[PDB]
Amino acid sequence: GKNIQVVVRCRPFNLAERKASAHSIVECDPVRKEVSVRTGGLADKSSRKTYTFDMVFGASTKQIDVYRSVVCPILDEVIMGYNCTIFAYGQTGTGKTFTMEGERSPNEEYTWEEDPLAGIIPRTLHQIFEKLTDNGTEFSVKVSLLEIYNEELFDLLNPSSDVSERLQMFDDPRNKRGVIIKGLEEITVHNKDEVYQILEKGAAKRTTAATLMNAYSSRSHSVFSVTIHMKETTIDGEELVKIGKLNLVDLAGSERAREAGNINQSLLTLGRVITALVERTPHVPYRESKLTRILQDSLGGRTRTSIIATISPASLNLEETLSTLEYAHRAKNILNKPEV
Amino acid sequence: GKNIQVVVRCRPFNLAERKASAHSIVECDPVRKEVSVRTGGLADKSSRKTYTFDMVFGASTKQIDVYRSVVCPILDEVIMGYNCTIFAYGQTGTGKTFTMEGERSPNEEYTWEEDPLAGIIPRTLHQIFEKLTDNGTEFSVKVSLLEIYNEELFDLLNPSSDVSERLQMFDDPRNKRGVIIKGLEEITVHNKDEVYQILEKGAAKRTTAATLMNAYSSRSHSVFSVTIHMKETTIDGEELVKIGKLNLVDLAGSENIGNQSLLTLGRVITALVERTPHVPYRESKLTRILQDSLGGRTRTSIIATISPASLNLEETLSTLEYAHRAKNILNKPEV
């Protein structure tokens, strides 16, 4: 048992894999919580590696089910006044952004209920407003969106100023763990719907940075953070002031010279940090990377942390799929159970 | 190079690339025969990267243009009685098979006019029958189709034989440059479009092999060889006996670089272009089977296919470097 949870989500086939005559090599067993991969080469149909995780989601798993099993328990902790983090890890094209943000799909004007393709960020903001409104709590909601590319922090919500200028990050006088990112824009969200316009502004800026600086999303880490100030009151029950925070991280693809070197280095540090938090090993290498330094005040002070590892089912991507499963296995090691 | 030609064919964006709002990072200039890749963001950048080749084919290039430009001169030499080869090299999904055999229109074939989607293989077979009949040449055509996977040969046209059966090569006593592929099926072609029927049998065999032997086509080399026996008679002229051969190779996906067969082919080509002492023909089964071609009097051509999207920047750059190393041409002045 842990406050740290590692799960795997397999996506369905894409057109390119079909056209290449790829074959299915992944088998997902949600009940036993295992994923098995056929790794055979020429004339080898008998070899297949099996891994076990906290949860396993197959190709048919819907958005709402990932939200209910993974995010719900975590948002509960946040509402109680804690700081938590959720990561999306995997090869480019396997579903990280689909999982973290989701899509709207052409159909027009959305009621109030959640779009079936909506991701974690959208559903999270919707629930915060719904839950806090229903219980009479006095609250305020603000979000921020920064991107880490080539080890440099870029604000994706700052209206003006936009161009290039990095943002400065330095340890601030106060109790340890935290850091201060000066200038980082913090947009106040007034209603549950307002989350979609905010994302747009972010996406638009994201594109400008990719085109005029080659800061492609597939090669950068996206940190979307939501902070909640809460104050509830009950007659004959004292008043409580709480502050909660949830970091939703869409990591760079796991598959220039150092540009990719730093990426591999940032992801590997994250692995070191996680595996460390799982084993209790005093001292975790937070400082070894910009990514882990920014989320330090989220991973340290006890809280729930989850990692969603996305993979492809196709033979054409055997190598990266195995790499992703290995990385996930290293983060939190859980033995396979008997009876195949 | 002279007889060795290296060209580039960039494909159009695909659905996945659009839906991801991918950025076009390659520019193809057919007139200057250059390919440029944007590696810098264009606000700082490290500048583009320009390569020059014998020909560059943009995204709008149609099948008939590639044929008219790359194949015609080559088939002319084949009909003269020579051995030639054409390769399609590149990342899975860039157009190797679309280029080498093409596709068929889901409906109306218009029997007499080549399906616009027809690739090099079908067009070639059709032109062979048309040209030799028109000049009254006595001739016969035969074809073979094999795939190489993890250095093992598999016959795709042998109706019998189980899937796990491989072919064994042997040195040909009559020619040091040649090889004998024992038991390789050579189907006689009696008329034009009968090529499609033969291509289907091979595809069915390839599917079986993928299923029962894990020989995935995206990780294998496919070698289609057509042999033409010719006897041309002209009263008051000369009586010519000829044998022509054309090998059409659809290579394994280039992302497979990182077995070594692709690097051995690259080295063999570089050596032929730069005329260096020894050509490493024997360092791979692919170059060994094709040694009879590539050598002696022969025109050789490599069609390198690429993607224009930022999503495949990595593999596209790799392909361009491989193509440049095979035959290095100096960039003209930025003029």
Ligand SMILES: Nc1ncnc2c1ncn2[C@@H]1O[C@H](COP(=O)(O)OP(=O)(O)O)[C@@H](O)[C@H]1O
């Ligand atoms: N679980 C899934 N269900 C449906 N489509 C998915 C799923 N995972 C991935 N996809 C598809 O794959 C594409 C690429 O994944 P998306 O997340 O952009 O990027 P990445 O995997 O690089 O984060 C999307 O267009 C989407 O249709």
Ligand SMILES: Nc1ncnc2c1ncn2[C@@H]1O[C@H](COP(=O)(O)OP(=O)(O)O)[C@@H](O)[C@H]1O
């Ligand atoms: N130049 C091109 N013109 C038209 N379609 C192309 C071109 N290049 C690629 N495509 C399309 O992209 C896909 C490429 O797959 P394929 O032809 O199998 O080649 P790759 O062999 O190198 O796997 C096919 O769907 C094909 O129709």
Ligand SMILES: [Mg+2]
């Ligand atoms: Mg993404």
Ligand SMILES: [Mg+2]
């Ligand atoms: Mg192909």
